[PDB]
Amino acid sequence: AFXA
Amino acid sequence: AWEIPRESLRLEVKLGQGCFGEVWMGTWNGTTRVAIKTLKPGTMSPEAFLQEAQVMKKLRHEKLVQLYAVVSEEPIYIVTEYMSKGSLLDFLKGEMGKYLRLPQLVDMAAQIASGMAYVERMNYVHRDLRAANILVGENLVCKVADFGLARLIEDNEYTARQGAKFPIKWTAPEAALYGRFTIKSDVWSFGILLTELTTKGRVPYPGMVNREVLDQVERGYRMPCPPECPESLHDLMCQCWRKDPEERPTFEYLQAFLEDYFTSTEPQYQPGENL
Numbered sequence: 001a002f003x004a
Numbered sequence: 005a006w007e008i009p010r011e012s013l014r015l016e017v018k019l020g021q022g023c024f025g026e027v028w029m030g031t032w033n034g035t036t037r038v039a040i041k042t043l044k045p046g047t048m049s050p051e052a053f054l055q056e057a058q059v060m061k062k063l064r065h066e067k068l069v070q071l072y073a074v075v076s077e078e079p080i081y082i083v084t085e086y087m088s089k090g091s092l093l094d095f096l097k098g099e100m101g102k103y104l105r106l107p108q109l110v111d112m113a114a115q116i117a118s119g120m121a122y123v124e125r126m127n128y129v130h131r132d133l134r135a136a137n138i139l140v141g142e143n144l145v146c147k148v149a150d151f152g153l154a155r156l157i158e159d160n161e162y163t164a165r166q167g168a169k170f171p172i173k174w175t176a177p178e179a180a181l182y183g184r185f186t187i188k189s190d191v192w193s194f195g196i197l198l199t200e201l202t203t204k205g206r207v208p209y210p211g212m213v214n215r216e217v218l219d220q221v222e223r224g225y226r227m228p229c230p231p232e233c234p235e236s237l238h239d240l241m242c243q244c245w246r247k248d249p250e251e252r253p254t255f256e257y258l259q260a261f262l263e264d265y266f267t268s269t270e271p272q273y274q275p276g277e278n279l
Contacts, residue, residue, distance in 0.1 A: 001022050001023060002019075002024070002026060003022050
């Protein structure tokens with residue numbers, strides 16, 4: 001989600 | 005409703021990027037260190053998100069990344085506790101991965117189980133537990149991030165539980181096939197997480213494609229015991245992967261088993277090359  | 009002005013945030017340093025957005029280290033109200041996760045427009049309904057955020061805010065536990073505030077207008081910002089060592093997945097694959105042995109990995113799993121045991125106690129469901137969504141801090145602290153987001157995603161293929169963005173390999177069959185997400189499907193995912201931990205971030209079911217995984221798992225296939233992993237720990241994974249969700253362990257149990265592992269279960273452990 002944010003870090004792939 | 006925990007909603008803040010976008011301009012009360014300063015996004016200073018990029019920490020990462022993923023399938024649905026980016027994350028930055030920054031400052032809130034010019035005084036507070038925070039992380040800000042920023043969602044690609046079109047990913048989820050601002051109203052649906054704002055509603056779920058009220059629930060996310062209630063989850064307060066040392067092993068869950070704390071929600072501080074939100075900006076519900078697109079691009080949605082999620083303001084949280086800041087963790088300095090990045091995602092667990094990248095941590096495992098990177099330079100520190102080589103220095104981690106079973107005792108560290110088991111302790112990290114125990115911390116994750118502790119946060120998930122709180123989620124379990126609170127009668128909530130994560131929906132996307134895996135190393136990519138766990139964060140690492142100083143002293144090998146691990147915390148679970150991104151609770152409550154999975155349900156809200158509107159991506160076309162993703163809602164069909166297909167495509168490159170849906171983590172089929174990490175998802176319980178009843179959840180992947182039927183959308184039956186429960187704390188027990190989170191338990192299955194924790195089992196997969198134990199494999200990620202013991203294989204230093206290798207993809208689950210190496211060499212297998214998504215459909216093959218689903219077909220085989222339905223027929224009873226389960227990943228084997230990794231090299232240097234004690235069979236007792238693989239047994240725990242297999243309990244997490246029981247076909248009947250109700251027969252999978254609780255996180256309360258997983259936490260305690262892992263915390264006591266090297267006195268109750270494997271006191272004769274000797275360090276190997278990798279684990």
